[PDB]
Write a protein that binds this ligand. Sequence first.
Ligand SMILES: Nc1nc2c(ncn2[C@@H]2O[C@H](COP(=O)(O)OP(=O)(O)OP(=O)(O)O)[C@@H](O)[C@H]2O)c(=O)[nH]1
Ligand SMILES: Nc1nc2c(ncn2[C@@H]2O[C@H](COP(=O)(O)OP(=O)(O)OP(=O)(O)O)[C@@H](O)[C@H]2O)c(=O)[nH]1
Ligand SMILES: Nc1nc2c(ncn2[C@@H]2O[C@H](COP(=O)(O)OP(=O)(O)OP(=O)(O)O)[C@@H](O)[C@H]2O)c(=O)[nH]1
Ligand SMILES: Nc1nc2c(ncn2[C@@H]2O[C@H](COP(=O)(O)OP(=O)(O)O)[C@@H](O)[C@H]2O)c(=O)[nH]1
Ligand SMILES: [Mg+2]
Ligand SMILES: [Mg+2]
Ligand SMILES: [Mg+2]
Lengths: 432, 432, 439, 37, 64, 429, 42, 37
Amino acid sequence: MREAICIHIGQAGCQVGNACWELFCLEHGIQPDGSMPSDDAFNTFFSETGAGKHVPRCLFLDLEPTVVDEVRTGTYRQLFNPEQLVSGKEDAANNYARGHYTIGKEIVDLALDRIRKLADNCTGLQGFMVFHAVGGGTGSGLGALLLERLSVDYGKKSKLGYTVYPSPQVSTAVVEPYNCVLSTHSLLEHTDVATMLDNEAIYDLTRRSLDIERPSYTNVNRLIGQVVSSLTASLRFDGALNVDLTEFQTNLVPYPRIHFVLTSYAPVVSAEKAYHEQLSVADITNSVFEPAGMLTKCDPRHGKYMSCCLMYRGDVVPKDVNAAIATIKTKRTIQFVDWCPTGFKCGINYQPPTVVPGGDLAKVQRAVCMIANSTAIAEVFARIDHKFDLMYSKRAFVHWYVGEGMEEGEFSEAREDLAALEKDYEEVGAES
Amino acid sequence: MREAICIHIGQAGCQVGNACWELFCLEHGIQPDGSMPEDDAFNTFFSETGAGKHVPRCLFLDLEPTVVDEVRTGTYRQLFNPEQLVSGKEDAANNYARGHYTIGKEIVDLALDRIRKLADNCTGLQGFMVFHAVGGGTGSGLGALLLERLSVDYGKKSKLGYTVYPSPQVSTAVVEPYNCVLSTHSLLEHTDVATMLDNEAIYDLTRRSLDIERPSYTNVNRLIGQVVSSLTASLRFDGALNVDLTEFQTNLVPYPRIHFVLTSYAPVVSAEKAYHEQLSVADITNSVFEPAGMLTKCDPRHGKYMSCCLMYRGDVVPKDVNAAIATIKTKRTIQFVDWCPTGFKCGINYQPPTVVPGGDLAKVQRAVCMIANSTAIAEVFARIDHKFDLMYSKRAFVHWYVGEGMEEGEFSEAREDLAALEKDYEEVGAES
Amino acid sequence: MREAICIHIGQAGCQVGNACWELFCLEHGIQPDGSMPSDKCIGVEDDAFNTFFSETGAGKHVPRCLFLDLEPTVVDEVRTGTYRQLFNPEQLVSGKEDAANNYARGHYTIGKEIVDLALDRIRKLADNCTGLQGFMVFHAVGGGTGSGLGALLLERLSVDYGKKSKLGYTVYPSPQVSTAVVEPYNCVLSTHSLLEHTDVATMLDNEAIYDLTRRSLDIERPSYTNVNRLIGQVVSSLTASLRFDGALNVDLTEFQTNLVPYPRIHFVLTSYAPVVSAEKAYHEQLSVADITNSVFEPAGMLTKCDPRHGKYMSCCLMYRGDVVPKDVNAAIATIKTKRTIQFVDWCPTGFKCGINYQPPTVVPGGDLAKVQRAVCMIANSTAIAEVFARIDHKFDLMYSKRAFVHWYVGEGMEEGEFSEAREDLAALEKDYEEVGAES
Amino acid sequence: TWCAKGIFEDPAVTRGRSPAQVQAALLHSTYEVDYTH
Amino acid sequence: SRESYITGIRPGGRYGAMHDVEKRRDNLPDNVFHYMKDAVQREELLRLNEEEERARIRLEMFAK
Amino acid sequence: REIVSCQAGQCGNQIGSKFWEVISDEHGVDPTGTYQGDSDLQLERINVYFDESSGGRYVPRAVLMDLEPGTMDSVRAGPYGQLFRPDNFIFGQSGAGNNWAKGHYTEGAELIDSVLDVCRKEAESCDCLQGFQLSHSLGGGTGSGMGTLLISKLREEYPDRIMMTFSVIPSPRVSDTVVEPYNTTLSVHQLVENSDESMCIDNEALYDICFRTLKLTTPTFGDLNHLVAAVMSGVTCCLRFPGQLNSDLRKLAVNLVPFPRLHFFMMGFAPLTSRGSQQYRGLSVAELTQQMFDAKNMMQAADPRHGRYLTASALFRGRMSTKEVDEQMLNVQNKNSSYFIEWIPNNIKSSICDIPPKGLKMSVTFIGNNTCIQEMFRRVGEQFTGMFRRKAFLHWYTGEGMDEMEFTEAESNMNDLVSEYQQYQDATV
Amino acid sequence: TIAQENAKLLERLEHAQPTYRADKFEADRRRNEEFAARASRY
Amino acid sequence: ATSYGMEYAITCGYTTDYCSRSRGAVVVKPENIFYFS
Ligand SMILES: Nc1nc2c(ncn2[C@@H]2O[C@H](COP(=O)(O)OP(=O)(O)OP(=O)(O)O)[C@@H](O)[C@H]2O)c(=O)[nH]1
Ligand SMILES: Nc1nc2c(ncn2[C@@H]2O[C@H](COP(=O)(O)OP(=O)(O)OP(=O)(O)O)[C@@H](O)[C@H]2O)c(=O)[nH]1
Ligand SMILES: Nc1nc2c(ncn2[C@@H]2O[C@H](COP(=O)(O)OP(=O)(O)OP(=O)(O)O)[C@@H](O)[C@H]2O)c(=O)[nH]1
Ligand SMILES: Nc1nc2c(ncn2[C@@H]2O[C@H](COP(=O)(O)OP(=O)(O)O)[C@@H](O)[C@H]2O)c(=O)[nH]1
Ligand SMILES: [Mg+2]
Ligand SMILES: [Mg+2]
Ligand SMILES: [Mg+2]
């Protein structure tokens, strides 16, 4: 019961999900072979077999075969299913048009076949969790196509997208703003929660708070996997306050157009500073609420908080959670919006976080991840649409998009609905 | 008790019989020498001889000596009788007239002698399973003659003809539509149930479900032998629902001229994918009803099912059997004809499939084999007689047939017989 | 009862009418000879073909059609075609010399010697029809005949028959794919008639059909035959409400009042869906919501005019098959929830729907495929100002220093007529802008 | 014809105590090095 | 407000109830009547299968 | 996935021979073709550039073109000459004589059928080919005429696939022939209309790099070909080896081409170190970035400071950390804002590959769509105008079937190519 | 021409209207207060 | 589940991998066999 199906679209999605899955196997005591050497708690992520073998409830799907083939040749070859591990022959080439109209159409059919088989194997499917980067091609085009098909097939079933948006300055691709503004369609219409995981915030967090000279995408994905494990532990393990996907879905999403939600996690500390600090619940809550520990590059002070959901793991106490809430309410720099008095969701779990061997996170008896919807997130859309307007003012890189079965008006309608996003963000943030 | 006679006519029949018998010996624990290392369970296929070993109830009848000599010099040389292994001296030369009017007559007498020996050795004979290929010459001509003789001689015994029809696109022969058209003339009159085993459906199934790059005639014959073993397991071993050849032939034949039936088998998986999937009864039934898991390329969406007979093997239970039945009725893309509300025949056996060492199929705790009569079958006959008309318009390849003691009018007679076959397929498919 | 008169002008009009009639005869079960051999599913003596076919004492069903071209190639091809027995020996007027892309030739020199016989035939058809709903004209403003003779014929019909309904189905020039160099001239000069003497003028440009066939049908090398097949599909879909029973029955005057808000604003936009081939017919879940979404999508539009670039003013749907009022209402509600299709402020309702229980009939040899349900858009929107903004810009660029004007002048045409055409096209732009402007 | 050597070769990799070992260490992948059991 | 038939939500689930569509036929053509009859029967089958799977999952979770 | 390569002319043949030496060195392929590598990664994606035979020998997916038969014999005499398939050597009897007309209409046309047949065979052998690659010198006859003609035919036959060309542009300092302007002008107008990305080599900049970056007393064409072969192997390293942020040639093209006419790119490599200062220099991402944007590191002779960077791409190879690579171009974007166009926010595409070239702990190839290529094209056009104004060396081209109009049209398309970069260099938001 | 549809696009973006008025919300709240006053005898 | 931990359960029935019709009432495996000790 309460199972959730993982989808990993694109290179970024596949790598993030692969870190997530090593973390899940380590947390549940599952070897890379896929067995327990020596309790229905793993069921929400792994499906049992008559031979006592565990298979992840995941679908890796990339239009290019390098990452998926290398995962196949990797350590978890016996863990991951030979199917639900789809590899293409030519990538989307960082093009929304290629990913959504030329190459995604010849693969989304078998993608839906795999998803349907996973759903049939499942029994209590809580929802889908999709990991992808909106700045790439496959994570944009194929992601939008798969989200469309899932919306028209599974209906109102929950779909949470742990997506990696462009960062304000640390960006890899040039047409990445195009890919983001065009994936805004799907990430606005056919998903219910969208959690931003931009790389610049991860980088600055592991710089000023975790203290390793040269972490990389591996550490980024490990921390993201820790975050997603914190979110899913409420249903994975028993606790004082247990919340499923739909439990916090409505508590976090106030309006259908308002579902892009910031994130943060703490304590993100190293072993050297772990044993000299009394990481109390109030301390970790304050660290999460401070922008120092915020997981997406956006300043909360420029906007107003609308609804937070807190996931505490470990020996956290229901006294400590609402004592931290009271201290936060007394605090003035963390201002909630006027029309949402409570603004708080709390879920406490009795399972302390597990640290991956050879990683950078230190073993802590308690942790907390905040997923918070706030009006301040209008800035990421404002900067991405400003970049889109600057590049689109004289049609740069648009011939690549329009030569692959895309119309001129698609960019215009992307600008239209992104515009409606900043306007309704501003208008719901405006005081009564 | 419940004995049955296998007749393998032609090269395809001989190869399929080799596969079936190498499967049956391992099924019953019989060594290739004929002797295994209170067991009246092999009687339907083997008979205990005057030496304490076991001789199969089969007749390998063929007009050319290569395949029968390969059998006589192979690993199963001591198993098969020196007789009942009939060897010719010159093949039908891919000519129905040659195999039915010139050389078939000088060999059908001794074929019937061997059949008589098998029958009076048997004590509870149920029927004859005929393995041949209507596409070629011997299996068409000599098969037609032998089936006519059995029909006029043995009365109303069961006639289960599992034959290899020509495939829609690639065919070994070029007079193959001629042979198919002229052989269906006899098989429409002297075959109680006819099953198609065309090559490309098995090729696609083995490519997409077994993940083997280049399977061959050996692999397709192994799959066909698995199908035949699943069909005969109901009488071979006891189970929840034991159904005989006579039991399902009337269930599967609605009208006297409506007896050509599709077939499908599942699960067909390799060792790599065997340990990763939970092969539930619902999953295997859905795979059967899917057009990718079937051994005939008669796309069921093009027609309406008339009667589907299912053979479950292993740990299958009647309740999830009928749950699969109900969800199949609930499936959108397939529909039944309006005068078959029941439309379903079910038979459950407790014996799971047995894999062959060095084979291509992995061990499965359960399996399901379908034989189905559906109105979509008219499409393959339409293609076959369209090709027949294309060749016969220019009178191509007709001199070979007319020079082997065959009248020219028989071509036309078979042509309008096929026309009437497609017309009454359409008639029975039409709603009341 | 509820008869309609088809009038085809020019080569494009003649071929469009040929496709329309080959669709109509098979839809009504009429053989190419002109008789219905035997129908058991359809009741005998059913007055469903009366609107398009007139009965004869020999059981013949003469189409209520007039063919009118100044040159005899296409009409002689029709005479020697497979519908020679079907079509009347008269009603099929032939000229001796075409207008040759000349509005002046089609309207002043060669049109006058054939307009008299055209009106003779039209009056014969009107006398035959006792319940005439109106005239459906089929032509293209690109050609000289279809421009000039079409303008003359519509003017004569308007002055003779008063306020009879007029459905001018016109193949306008496309933005880039065009076949005539004086086509901007012909189009800008035909707007006088198409604006004054036409009740509903339907956009039917070519390259939009080309793109629709190349994308939806997945066919690489189609032609005017396929274009005409689709245009006839659309025409039959929108006009079969008055021929077959349905939940919502609509006539020509019944829906033109909905389409046209203002006397000058009567140029309308078309789309049709689900347009699929044999391979793609079963590859999609074609429900009412899906087909309505595909209709409202700009991809399925039959003319180069982005709906997102303007304001929808009036809109009505023609549903065919097993469609249901709840399904169409749910489709409407989904369209309102969708914001990419946004209507004008002063028209809240903006919607009309008609339902017919007759599913579309697929012609053998055509690229269409049978569909359990289908639907055709017809909508008047402010976005149609852009096709005029293109054609008048093209006309001005050609008319900057009097190109091709001597050909028109030498055929008894006043020079100032070009300026007058430019002026009322500018007016047809300005009133679009004003009606689309927010109150 | 003569071509210069060492232009496209780093000394730490090519020449040293364990050149083959350092080459083998280099020739692994980031997933292999980071993700092990 | 009153938007239930488009939202698709009624008490008792999205699926309706069995009824005799032969009685509900009133001058509708054969195609529309066949579509309605197939829809009603198939709806009933969906309802039975949904109830069966719900009960089965109830039983399984209790067994756990 | 698979990439099939074409070598045109003597220059292209030597450069391609060096490139295949580099590729076999990277993938552990012996001159006899046997595999001697000790890793799974080398063999995992060897099919991109190689095809296995029945005996296990790996043969390059390469074809060779030269109207002079001696170049093919030189390739045989090369250390890796035995590696190529013998039937991929299509050679004529009479050379082009540094005549574009001879290499494009008379001798190239009568011989191009065989090379198209061989490329079609290779294309059909490829499971799903990524694109086509070509190495040629636009200043010659065979490398220009046959090269351009083959680019045109492969574009016609394979419109979806991506064309890559390495064109050795001549310079007045290294003007070793007399008809460089003629050949380059007559070939650039096929390059612009038939190549998806066409990156330039100048022997002047190659010699400059060998002088004041490599500090070698007397390098040779071998060293120049090695310098171009390193970046040629690095531009396709993502297909063959995994990476933290994998890319491919189509991603590089889409990120480096903002408008269809602007597909002439920069070309550079790092770390390039002298034989002496090599042990003392600490190879880091900062050093690689500092060397990439240095003018002296560019292997074409045009100052990148004069022009503005429309866009650029950095193929970093070696197990790296990602915020360092991202920030070392973010800070370059910040401190050289006058050297980058404003209307594109991010002008850098960073691509990371796990496997660096063997013998290095770290490497990078730089490909940039800079706006100062118009300087090189302007110089070529000025030389062409000077020669063409007075029928100089024109009868040789005209007598081989060419028309006097085609020279004017080639100069006109050169003018279009120059004017595009000119009017995007000073463009303002 | 690109400046022409850039101006048209800028105008359409300026005219773009969000899904949430907060003035329609206020009007609906006035209606809600009217309904509450109609009910709620106290 | 016993007081001594997870432990093999004792049932009554024939265990047959070969589901032969005749051997329904015949022990054919060492599983059903017990020996005194
Ligand atoms: N968090 C995280 N982001 C990654 C990782 N790898 C790549 N990315 C993101 O991916 C973006 C670049 O997109 P691409 O290189 O095109 O990868 P993609 O999004 O999967 O798109 P395709 O390559 O076409 O499949 C960068 O801006 C990164 O933010 C990763 O390992 N972790
Ligand atoms: N499934 C299967 N079919 C086979 C096999 N071998 C041959 N066939 C089929 O047999 C057809 C050709 O006929 P033959 O194999 O020659 O059999 P035959 O016609 O009785 O023998 P001849 O009369 O001598 O031609 C081909 O179209 C094949 O489809 C086999 O091993 N397995
Ligand atoms: N949709 C459609 N358009 C057509 C068809 N035939 C021609 N056209 C287009 O319509 C334009 C004008 O048609 P016409 O009025 O018949 O011009 P024409 O064919 O030259 O004949 P004339 O009017 O006598 O000059 C032509 O330029 C064609 O591009 C057709 O069958 N269907
Ligand atoms: N990098 C490099 N350039 C070369 C080599 N050989 C010739 N070139 C250049 O190629 C140009 C002449 O090309 P050419 O040999 O005439 O081409 P072809 O006529 O097609 O064979 C000259 O400007 C040289 O600088 C070489 O081995 N390496
Ligand atoms: Mg990728
Ligand atoms: Mg044979
Ligand atoms: Mg004409």
